[PDB]
Amino acid sequence: HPVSSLTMLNDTLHNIRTTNQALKKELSQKTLTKTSLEEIALHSSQISMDVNKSAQLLDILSRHEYPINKDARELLHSAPKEAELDGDQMISHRELWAKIANSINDINEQYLKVYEHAVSSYTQMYQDFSAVLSSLAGWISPGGNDGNSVKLQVNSLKKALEELKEKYKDKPLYPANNTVSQEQANKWLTELGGTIGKVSQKNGGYVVSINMTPIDNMLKSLDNLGGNGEVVLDNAKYQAWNAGFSAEDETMKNNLQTLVQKYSNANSIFDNLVKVLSSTISSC
Numbered sequence: 001h002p003v004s005s006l007t008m009l010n011d012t013l014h015n016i017r018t019t020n021q022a023l024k025k026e027l028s029q030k031t032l033t034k035t036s037l038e039e040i041a042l043h044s045s046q047i048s049m050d051v052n053k054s055a056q057l058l059d060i061l062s063r064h065e066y067p068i069n070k071d072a073r074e075l076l077h078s079a080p081k082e083a084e085l086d087g088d089q090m091i092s093h094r095e096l097w098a099k100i101a102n103s104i105n106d107i108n109e110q111y112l113k114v115y116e117h118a119v120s121s122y123t124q125m126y127q128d129f130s131a132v133l134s135s136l137a138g139w140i141s142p143g144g145n146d147g148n149s150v151k152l153q154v155n156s157l158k159k160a161l162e163e164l165k166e167k168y169k170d171k172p173l174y175p176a177n178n179t180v181s182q183e184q185a186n187k188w189l190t191e192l193g194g195t196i197g198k199v200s201q202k203n204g205g206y207v208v209s210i211n212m213t214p215i216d217n218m219l220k221s222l223d224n225l226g227g228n229g230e231v232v233l234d235n236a237k238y239q240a241w242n243a244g245f246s247a248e249d250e251t252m253k254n255n256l257q258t259l260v261q262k263y264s265n266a267n268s269i270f271d272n273l274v275k276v277l278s279s280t281i282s283s284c
Contacts, residue, residue, distance in 0.1 A: 019050070020271045028264070048108065051105055058101035062101070078276045107269060111269060126252050154225050161218055165212045173208050192262055
């Protein structure tokens with residue numbers, strides 16, 4: 001009976017915790033590697049399997065209106081504010097078990113998933129830009145005299161750069177696979193910075209897509225360079241350009257970290273949730 005559900009939910013909750021903790025250590029990392037990413041994808045899907053597994057049990061406890069003592073209820077006060085759980089309020093056990101389940105799904109869907117996408121999306125792109133950098137090394141050679149003059153495969157770099165922007169031109173950061181009101185779309189953008197993404201409309205609604213300004217500025221700088229598809233610039237001119245180029249790179253490098261942050265934070269709140277949720281369950 002619902003008493004087994006009570007114990008199965010604790011197992012599932014402990015599991016969610018195990019996965020979460022494994023995910024955090026991953027995000028505390030320097031380089032969102034192609035591996036560190038699918039690493040997350042698998043960890044998220046797993047967390048999603050348990051949440052649903054939980055939702056199923058939590059639902060049983062609700063229908064059977066399994067009581068939640070005052071003490072166990074008081075424990076809810078320690079859960080995250082975002083969770084939206086009351087340490088009492090003396091409401092139906094049915095509604096409590098329901099709100100709890102809603103909290104697990106809400107956080108996981110509105111926080112974890114929401115950021116696991118923006119983080120993944122941006123990561124993937126910058127990972128494609130880093131591939132260009134690697135190529136940039138074989139695109140520079142000594143030109144002229146030479147005495148520090150540099151030959152740059154303008155076209156080659158321009159071509160690569162215009163393929164990247166293309167690949168991520170319309171890629172969205174939020175929502176992962178849906179639309180929203182331009183008003184609520186402008187909201188999310190203003191909540192994670194504003195420079196990171198750009199509000200746009202596909203159709204059926206609006207979405208916050210990746211801001212390709214850094215790449216545009218990069219192309220504008222290369223266009224200004226001169227004749228194609230090979231240009232030679234003295235040291236002063238090269239460095240000056242590299243400075244600009246390198247700048248743009250860091251702009252993305254930064255935004256990338258910002259996202260990685262909002263994601264880790266979401267992991268924290270979720271973790272705090274399961275931690276007190278588990279204590280609550282136990283106290284039953």
